[PDB]
Design a protein around this nucleic acid. Structure first.
Ligand SMILES: Nc1ncnc2c1ncn2[C@@H]1O[C@H](CSCC[C@H](N)C(=O)O)[C@@H](O)[C@H]1O
Length: 327
DNA sequence: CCATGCGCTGAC
DNA sequence: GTCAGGCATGG
């Protein structure tokens, strides 16, 4: 994460829905805002959260009486994506995990906050001939809010990882906000090799498979892109090897393969996966954040998460707009 | 609860 | 042609 000097959101309140590790809380707090309510139903996600923030989130949002929820100015939500991803079955609104958006709509109807801030995968903007996106837009306009949306890549915002996601921002109509803008990209200067831990700490993660087929030559000059150098088995998900002189592939939550969830990399002459701390760094978390004692739950948590840096820039732009009020 | 080999989709 | 992005079943 980055350091923020000018605290644009001081004085405001927000809620943390579909919480996870709490990536949305770290970003809004750095800008000055206060959290007054959080929700998340996973047993192990509730444990890490409490370890880092000192409070246990409330359970299953579908059984909560929205009238029970505190007053607030901004609603934060990074809802489930398994039903919308190109790696799954694209069932969408017909999937048991695909109707969470309607619970959000229901809460907004009662609480009517100033801003609603959501996040999902890239394919959300295309799914079902574009019907899925128009439905989200229409619901929001019907509730008296404006609708801004765009797809952004983490490699353009200072983090060495190829992660393309859609971001959706909505302002209440009586506020007449006419000057909101997504942030502008900038040159990358950090690569995978610059975030690695020492060899004496990851010996246990090295893999030696005899069906390895090196297909490309290592590069000596860094680049802002993924550079494949070889393969194992048939070369499907989790069986591909990359150079640390480029950028990292997308981290995942339910993925398989011998190099599961992180992918494989070439370090000092051998092939290995990434460690939980190296995972925290490619998502922008600081070294002071405590990871879960179970290595398996830690990999899954980081794979479902958000890149903090991209959220800090966007949150600052929301505040700049709310603060411009001339006579 | 944890490990791993797919086997297809989308955007080129 | 090329390559990046959860499900099913084993135990
Ligand atoms: N019905 C429900 N009630 C509460 N939490 C739910 C839920 N259905 C799914 N979830 C939670 O929604 C989360 C979506 S992934 C979100 C990660 C979070 N933005 C982060 O900053 O790390 C998962 O952790 C999942 O356990």
């Amino acid at each position: 994460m980055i350091e923020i000097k000018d605290k644009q959101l001081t004085g405001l309140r927000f809620i943390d829905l579909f919480a996870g590790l709490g990536g949305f809380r770290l970003a809004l707090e750095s800008c000055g805002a206060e959290c007054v309510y959080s929700n998340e139903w996973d047993k192990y996600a509730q444990e890490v959260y409490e370890m880092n923030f000192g409070e246990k989130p409330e359970g299953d949002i579908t059984q909560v009486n929205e009238k029970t929820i505190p007053d607030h100015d901004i609603l934060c939500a990074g809802f489930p994506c398994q039903a919308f991803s190109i790696s799954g079955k694209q069932k969408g609104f017909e999937d048991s995990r695909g109707t969470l958006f309607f619970d959000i709509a229901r809460i907004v109807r009662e609480k009517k906050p100033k801003v609603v801030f959501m996040e999902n995968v890239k394919n959300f903007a295309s799914h079902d001939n574009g019907n899925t996106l128009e439905v989200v837009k229409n619901t929001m306009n019907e509730l008296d809010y404006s609708f801004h949306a765009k797809v952004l890549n983490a490699l353009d915002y200072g983090i060495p990882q190829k992660r393309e996601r859609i971001y959706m921002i909505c302002f209440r109509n009586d506020l007449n906000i006419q000057n909101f803008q997504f942030p502008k990209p900038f040159e990358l200067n950090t690569f995978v090799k610059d975030l690695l831990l020492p060899d004496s700490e990851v010996e246990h993660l090295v893999i030696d498979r005899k069906d390895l087929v090196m297909t490309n030559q290592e590069i000596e000059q860094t680049t802002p892109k993924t550079v494949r150098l070889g393969i194992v088995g048939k070369g499907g998900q989790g069986e591909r090897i990359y150079s640390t002189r480029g950028i990292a592939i997308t981290l995942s939550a339910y993925g398989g393969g011998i190099f599961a969830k992180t992918g494989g990399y070439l370090v000092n002459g051998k092939t290995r996966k990434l460690h939980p701390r190296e995972c925290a760094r490619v998502m922008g978390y600081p070294d002071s954040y405590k990871v879960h004692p179970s290595t398996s739950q830690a990999y899954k948590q980081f794979g479902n998460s958000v890149v903090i840096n991209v959220l800090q820039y966007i949150a600052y732009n929301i505040g700049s707009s709310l603060n411009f009020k001339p006579y």
